[PDB]
Amino acid sequence: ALCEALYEYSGLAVLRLPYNFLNDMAAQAVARLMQVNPGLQLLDLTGNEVTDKGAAAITEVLAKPEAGLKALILRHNPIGDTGALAVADMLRSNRSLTLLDLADCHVAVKGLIGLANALTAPEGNRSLQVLDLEDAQLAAPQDSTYQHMSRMLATNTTLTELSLAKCRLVDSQLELLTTYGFARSSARWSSLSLRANRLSPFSGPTLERLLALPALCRLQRLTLASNSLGNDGASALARVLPTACPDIRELDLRSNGIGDVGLLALAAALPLVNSLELLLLWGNSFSPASSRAVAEALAAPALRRLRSDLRPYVVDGEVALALQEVE
Amino acid sequence: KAVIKNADMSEEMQADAVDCATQALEKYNIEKDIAAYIKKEFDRKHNPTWHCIVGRNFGSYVTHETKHFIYFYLGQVAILLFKS
Amino acid sequence: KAVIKNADMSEEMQADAVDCATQALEKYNIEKDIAAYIKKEFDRKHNPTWHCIVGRNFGSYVTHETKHFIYFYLGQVAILLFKS
Amino acid sequence: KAVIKNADMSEEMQADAVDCATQALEKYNIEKDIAAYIKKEFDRKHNPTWHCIVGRNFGSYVTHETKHFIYFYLGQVAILLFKS
Amino acid sequence: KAVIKNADMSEEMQADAVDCATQALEKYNIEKDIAAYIKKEFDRKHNPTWHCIVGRNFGSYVTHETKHFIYFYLGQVAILLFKS
Amino acid sequence: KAVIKNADMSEEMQADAVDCATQALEKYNIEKDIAAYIKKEFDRKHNPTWHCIVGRNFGSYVTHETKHFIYFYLGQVAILLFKS
Amino acid sequence: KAVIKNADMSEEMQADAVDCATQALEKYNIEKDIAAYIKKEFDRKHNPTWHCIVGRNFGSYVTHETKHFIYFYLGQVAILLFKS
Amino acid sequence: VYEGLWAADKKNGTGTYFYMSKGKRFDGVWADGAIKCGTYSEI
Amino acid sequence: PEADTSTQTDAFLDRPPTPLFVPQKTGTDAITQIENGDLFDFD
Incomplete structure (x- = not known):
């Protein structure tokens, strides 16, 4: 489609695809582009149909210690627990992302446990400054994710703002x-x-x-x-x-x-x-x-x-x- | 910035309904499709029993459960979202 | 006047619904009144939980237990009614 | 031209209100239909709950949602526009 | 006396509005004063908002909450009164 | 005054349970949420594990361990609270 | 036909639980008797520790053994069963 | 303080017990145990 | 120590339901008039 045929080289401070009902192969395309073009600082793919395959593609092209990216915004995306584990894994190796915004993405106890664990001080990330999580559907009385986040808070010394909006x-x-x-x-x-x-x-x-x-x-x-x-x-x-x-x-x-x-x-x-x-x-x-x-x-x-x-x-x-x- | 007309409901899930309507309006205008999107959202987040109506004007008479009913105006559509 | 395009009902049951609405449009005037009366009829006539929505214009997406659900245009007012 | 006497509204929105009221006072014929066109256009482009009153001798005591109120003269009539 | 030209209220509300207006008119004469008295009485008696228009020549086009709209004459002076 | 219809509990523990229920009623309205407050309250203060069920109409059969069972009427509800 | 609103147990035990509850409805009528029958026969089917509550209006916040929990309805009566 | 009928306990005798420290008092029947029924009130 | 106990809830007096919702008054109060000598000119 139109999205997949974007080819650019110069500048690209930010990219804003507001909703545009992105498919997942389109996410593969944008990850491929950003891999072969190490120039960008902000990526915004809110409200798409990006599934775990495009999530995996973007995460693995970011996990390289080169081609830095600073802000990653992905809201309203059914990224699930597999996607949450992939993003936690990639953060474990990345050093350039400073803002990780994963809101309205269907995260469960497993995925958000993984996210909370991937930022403990020894093995975590000094890089992230803004971790935005929301709609963590712990409807069941799940009392362990908050303990892992407490360990995050006790060990990490780089975060500056967080949200537990609409988390039970x-x-x-x-x-x-x-x-x-x-x-x-x-x-x-x-x-x-x-x-x-x-x-x-x-x-x-x-x-x-x-x-x-x-x-x-x-x-x-x-x-x-x-x-x-x-x-x-x-x-x-x-x-x-x-x-x-x-x-x-x-x-x-x-x-x-x-x-x-x-x-x-x-x-x-x-x-x-x-x-x-x-x-x-x-x-x-x-x-x-x-x-x-x-x-x-x-x-x-x-x-x-x-x-x-x-x-x-x-x-x-x-x-x-x-x-x-x-x- | 929805206006709340009637409520038998908490506040956190009212906020969920309001911004759910905002997201659904950014996504669509077709009344069946916005109703479907809101229905799926509140059948997933909360255990699936709910349903809703998104109309410019209509009349209603329903038997919601004691603690799940909201009637609010947002954007251009009266939204009546309740459980059953 | 009566014409139905979406209904998941039995023949005599549809006839009963059409008759109740066709009487209620002259009994009452307002859309909430028509909905309330038809709901009371299918409430104390068949089952203790029926829900009705009456609209001149609206879009709705509801979940109904199977075989008890109707949507019809009785001339100048849209009417819908389902089981729990 | 037009005259704006007593306002609680942004300047660009006042200009749009004057343009709308002038086209209405031009094309239409009767005061209530002037009100009708003004209300329908502000509804179709901004927000649902508007209220319009085109009078020539009347005094009211109205309540309006903040940052939405205008009381202005155009020709031989006084227009009151408020959101509620 | 009282000509109830166009109303959609109930009978108890009808008498309350009419005798409150009759009470106001023997107190004051300015449109501001009459509208203020009547609508303060009705706000403190019923509900949050009440738009009151007092005058002799004016149109209107206003969205009302059902069963809370009235338009009547007391001799020559006219009163519109509606809640929204 | 409260009414301790049935119980198996020490006396100061009786007082603790009824007083905690009093606090829950003074701050709360929902049923399961009062139950959760009291359950967490004893799960924290007193012996490790508990269970609680608050309601207006219900019948029960449980194997409480001794001296940690209580079923008393307070306010408009009835509280069953027991450790297993 | 019984509806399982929530559960943590396995499918075969769920079928056994629904059969248990239907049998209790067939035999007795008082909620205490329903609970006693269901609880004791599960106790002898599987293991010593079980708990059952039968009611039309109750809220529960319970802490139970793994894989043995079912909150299910029977037309209008709600039954909560779990392992200690 | 406890005031009532006593068989070292558990005599189902209408007694009265005073949470004087808290400021509450419980009057009723110590039916064959520390508790079976009664009314709990505010002095 | 494990004992069994059963119970069944008895009559609760009727309690009135939750009262009805009136939203907050969300608007400024105003005032309006057209007096003598306004808006008009004899010629």
């Missing part, structure tokens, strides 16, 4: 991760994204312990959203945020059952943080008193450039009420 993540698993990987890690964590997990309000103490750590010192992009926290969780964030994370660039609490008491507690604690820029909290609940408090707080003189998804308007009776507001 009970508070027991999260407590295991927090303690056994973060109370022992030593790195610089930029972002940890936990949107859409199964988190109880009981996660207040463990979330507090997580956010008050030396390893998580310069935590910047925290996106703890879409879980099922509550007033207790909001209070925990309120009483741990102002001190522990000194420069947290953005905060995102969307769809947690925040209610109103947690909002009241967080209102009187938002002002003491001046490093917040993107504060995203819509879709929880807003009583008139809580809306009044948030209007009182958000407009605190110190917090000028604090973008949010709230606009506080006024109606009769001075019932200041907040609505949604796109960036």
